[PDB]
# Entry
Amino acid sequence: MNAIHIGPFSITPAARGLHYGGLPHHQWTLYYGPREMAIKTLPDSYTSSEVRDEFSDIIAEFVIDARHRYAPDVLELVNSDGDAVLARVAVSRLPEALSGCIPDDRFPYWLLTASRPRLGLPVTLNEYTALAVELSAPPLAWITGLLPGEVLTHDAEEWRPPTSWELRHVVGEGSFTGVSGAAAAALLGMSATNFRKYTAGDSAANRQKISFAAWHYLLDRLGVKRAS
Amino acid sequence: MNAIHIGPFSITPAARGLHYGGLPHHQWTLYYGPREMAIKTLPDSYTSSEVRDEFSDIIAEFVIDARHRYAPDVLELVNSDGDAVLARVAVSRLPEALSGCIPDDRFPYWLLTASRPRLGLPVTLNEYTALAVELSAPPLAWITGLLPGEVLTHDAEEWRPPTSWELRHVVGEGSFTGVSGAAAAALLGMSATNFRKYTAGDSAANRQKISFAAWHYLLDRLGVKRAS
Amino acid sequence: ILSTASVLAFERKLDPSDALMSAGAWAQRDASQEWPAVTVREKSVRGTISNRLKTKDRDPAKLDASIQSPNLQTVDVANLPSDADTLKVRFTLRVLGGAGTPSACNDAAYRDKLLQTVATYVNDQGFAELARRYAHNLANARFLWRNRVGAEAVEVRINHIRQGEVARAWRFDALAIGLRDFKADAELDALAELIASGLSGSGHVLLEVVAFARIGDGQEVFPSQELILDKGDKKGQKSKTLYSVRDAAAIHSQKIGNALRTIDTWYPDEDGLGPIAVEPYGSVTSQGKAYRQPKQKLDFYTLLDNWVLRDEAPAVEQQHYVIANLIRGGVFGEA
Amino acid sequence: ILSTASVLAFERKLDPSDALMSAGAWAQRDASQEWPAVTVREKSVRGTISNRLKTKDRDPAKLDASIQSPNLQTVDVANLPSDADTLKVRFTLRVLGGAGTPSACNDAAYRDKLLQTVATYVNDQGFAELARRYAHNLANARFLWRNRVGAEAVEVRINHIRQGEVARAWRFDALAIGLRDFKADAELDALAELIASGLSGSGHVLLEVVAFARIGDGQEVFPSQELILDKGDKKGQKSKTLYSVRDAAAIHSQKIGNALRTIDTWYPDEDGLGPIAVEPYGSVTSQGKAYRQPKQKLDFYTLLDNWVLRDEAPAVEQQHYVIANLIRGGVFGEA
Amino acid sequence: GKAYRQPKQKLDFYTLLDNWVLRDEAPAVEQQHYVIANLIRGGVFGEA
# Structure
C-alpha cells in the first residue's frame, strides 16, 4: 500500500502485486536504513497494524541485538583480595590512567574491568565516586553504537549534523528512546512545529538543520550521550 | 576615563574630577549590577590595571563569599560506625529518600548529609554509585546562586532567556567560570561573532537572545549546572 | 544660547528633625511631655524558609534540611509597654524661603534665568497649592508610615513656635484627612498660608508636630531601620537594627521629608492610585516603577529645560511639580 | 503575558503583642490585674553524660573520665511561686485588613489581577472560614505552647477594646475546644464575625487575650527561649536564656502569631497530626518535614500562580490556604 | 564515678532501644521497663 515508518525502520511494500492463493499479495520489506532486514509476503487485506506486529518480532530482535552489541563496559569495585565484587558501574569511556594490575592488600578498594584481561587502578571511595561521576554511561548509550563518530564528537569542527535517518532514530514514533515529537520538542524548549521542521526531511523547505548545542542537549535529555 | 568590565563587575568613574592633594583624582565606583560595593578615590594618572588591582581585593572577597554562600551540599558515605567518613560527594540536590538517620550495624554502609541534623539512608555501593551519578553537583555550581531561577529552569514556558549581565556571569572577561568568549563559543559550536552578538547588549540590532538548548548546554559544558 | 548649567545643587527646604517616639495613653496627650520613650529591645526569632525557591531547592530533602536547621536571628524590636496604647511621634519642621536660589551654580546666566522664572511663577501663582499640599501631608500623619495602617485613631498637633512660645496651634484628625484627596479646610488654609509665608521668604516658620496614634496596648511600633553590616556569625546575625538616638526609638528625618513631599498627583499615569513623592522621575520604590519617565515629556529635568532654556512654560500643575522639586532640593545638574 | 511580580512583599495581618507572663492563683483570675510577674531567675545544673557516643567515647575508662568531669551550667528558669499555681498570659491582637493589597508590587497589572482574585474570593466566600479557624486558635490557648501539655484547666478571656474599653467580652474553655477539631459555637462564631470585619476592612479590631493555666504550685512555666552568644567560660556557660521584657518573663510575639496561624488542615498528608501553621511549603519545625511539598503541587506559590496567572482556581480549601498565607504575609516573589 | 550499663555490655539505653525498635529484638522485661523509664525521664536522644 505504502511504506510504514516505524523507528528508523521503513516497511516498504513492492509496487507489483502478486496473487498467492486466492488473495492479492505484496512483497513487504523491512529496511533499517539502506539495508534490507527481512523479505516476506503479506496479503493486501491485512491492515498496516497487522504488518506491524508481524514485523515486531524481527524489530525486537534487532533491538536486543543493538542493546547487547553496544552495551557499555562495566568496571567493578572489588576488595583487596579481588574475588568479591562490592560494586559495578556501567562506564561510558575507559579511563586513561588504568593499566594491567593485580589487587593487593596495600589498598582496600580496586577498580577493574569486566573482561578477563582485568585492567584497573587502586582507588579509594571518593576517587571511585569521582570516576563514576565523570565516566558513567547514560541508560540509552547503546544508540551511540548506531550513530557515527562524526555526529557524536564534542568538537564543532569535526562535528557533522545528523541526517533525517540519524535524527529519526531517536525523535518520535516507535523510536529506540520511545519518546514522541512533542516530548522531544518540550525537552528542547520550543514548540512542536519548529521541531517538526527538524524531523521532516525531503525538500529543503522545512529542512532546517539542528544545531550542535541543541543536538547535544537533546542527547543529554534523552539519556543517550553526555548524560552522566 | 571609561568603565572597566570584569565579568558582571563594572568599575565606572564619576564624571566629576577632584583634586585631592595636589594631583587630580576621580571617584571610581565598583558595581555588581545595580549594587555598589566599593567607592574609592583614585588618581587620574592610574592605569586601568592599577584601578583593577585597587578593587581586586574586594572582588576576590565577594567571589569567596559567593563560593561559601552558594556551595552545594555534601553527602558523606560512612561505615556502620557512622564516624569514619569513607566518601564525600558534593551533590546538586539530595535524594528524596533522605530522612533523619543515625547509622547502625544493621547495614554496612550509610549515606548522610553534612548538616547537623543529618539526613540519610542505608545504601549499598551500587545504589550510592547510582545516587552519585544522578545527583552530583558540577564544580562551578555556586554561580547558579548568582543567577536567577528563571534562567536555570528546565521547563519551556517558565524560562526567560538570560540578559547580557547573566551571560557575562559565566562567559567573558573576568567571568566566574574563568573562560573567555572564544572558548565558550567553541563549547557551543557557534562562531565568535555570532556569540559576540549574544554577549553584547545595548540596542536590539546585532543582539539576539540565546535559545533554551544552547544556554542549557553552555551551562552543562561550563560545569555550572546539570553537569554530573 | 543659555546652555545648561553644570552644577545645580539646591538646599532642602522644609527641614524636619528626627521624629522621636515615646509611649503613653490616649486622653493623656496634653500631659505628654513627660511620657517615657520607646526603647529598642532585642528578641530572638527562629524561622523556616518561606520565600520562593530557586528550583534547585524544590528538592523535598533540601526543604526538610532547611526546616531541621531553621534560621536564627536577633532582631531589634520597638514595642509599647502593655499599659500604653498611644504612640507619640514628635518632630520639628523649619520652613525656609529662597526656594529658587541654588546653593551652587556654574552659570550666572542660568542662575539669573532660574531666579527670574521662579519670580514670575510666584507673581502669577505663588506657593499656595504646594503649601496647601504640604499642610495636608502635615495634617494626615503620613510620617507615621506603618504607625497608621492599623492605628485606631490618629491626632496631629502642629504648633507655630515664635520666640520660643506657641503662636498658633492646629489640631487635625489625621484619619478624616485622607491620604488620597487634597480637600480644603480653614485650619488647613491657615497652615497653608503660614507655609506659604515661610516659603516666600516673608517670615520664619518653625513648627512642632506631634502625632498620637492608637497602635494598641503593647503593640509593635515601626521606627526607621538602619544598615546591616553582617560582620558576625549566622546565628547571632542581628538581622534588623532600628533607629534610636539616646535610648529612644526614632524615625529618620528623610522619611518625614519624604512623607511631606508626597504631593505629586500630576504624573502621566493614572492618579487614582494616589499621590506620590515629588522627586525627579517620580519614583516610588515599593511599586518599583518610575512615573514621569524621561521618554515622556513630564519628568522634572525636561520640564525644567523647557521652562528655562527655551521658555516653553508647562501646565500649571507640572510647574507646581517643578517648583516642588526646587523646594525639596537635590543635586540637580549634569556631570 | 501576565507574569508574577518580582517583589511581592506582604504585611502581616493579625499582629500580636508580646505575651507577658505573670503568676497567680485559680479563682482569683477575675481580679488578676495586680498579679506579680513571672521573673526569669537562674539555677545551677550539674549533668553527666546522656547523649549518644560516637563509638570512641564508649570505652569504659573514657566514659568514666567523662563522668568525673560533669558539665556544670547555669540555666535561666521560670517557675511560679509556691503559693501560685496559675500562669496568666496577656497579649493584644490587632486585626488590620487589606490582605489582598501587597506592600510592594513591581507589576501593576499583576497587582490588579491579584486584587481581582482576592475580590472574587471574597465575593465567593468572605473571610469567614479563615476567621473561624483563627478564632478557634484564639479560643484554645495554642499560644500557651508547653504551658498546656500538662495543664489541668485552661481558660481564655478575649475582650474587644474599641475606644480603650471593653466593647464585647468572651470567656472560653481552652481544653474543651481542642487543638484538633474546628467545630461551631455561638461565641466562637461572634468572634469569627469580629475577625471577619477586621480582615475585610469593615472596622478596627483590637482584642485583649488573657490566658490562665492550672499548671501547679511552684511548677516550671515555659516562656520563649532566646539565643545564646556563647562567649563566657564553660563553668558559667548559660546554656539556656529565657525571654523577658522588663524583669518579667514573656513569650515572643511571632510565636503567638504562629500558634494563632495553626489552622492549616488541608495539607495532602493525613489528619493524624491535625492543623499545622499556614506557611509557604507548610513547614513544621517539630516534625522536621514539609507538608504541602512543591512536588505534590499544593504549596502556596504553585496554587497562587495557578489562581492568578492562568485563572486555574483551586479548591475552596486551597483558596482558604492561599488567602491565609496572604493574611500571614511574607516576602513572596523572586529575590 | 563508675558507669554501670556500659555500652560494651550492650545494656545501656541506646542499644536496647535500637534493638527494640529497629531490629524488633525486645529485651528482658526489666530492661524494657528501664528503657521506658528513660523515655519518661526525657532526653536529647538521637545524634549528638
Q: What stands out?
A: Chain D has seven helices and 15 strands. The helical segments of chain D are 60-67, 108-124, 129-139, 186-200, 253-260, 300-308, 316-328. Chain D has two domains: 1-11+99-126+263-335, 12-98+127-262. Chain D touches chain B through six residues (CB under 8 Å).
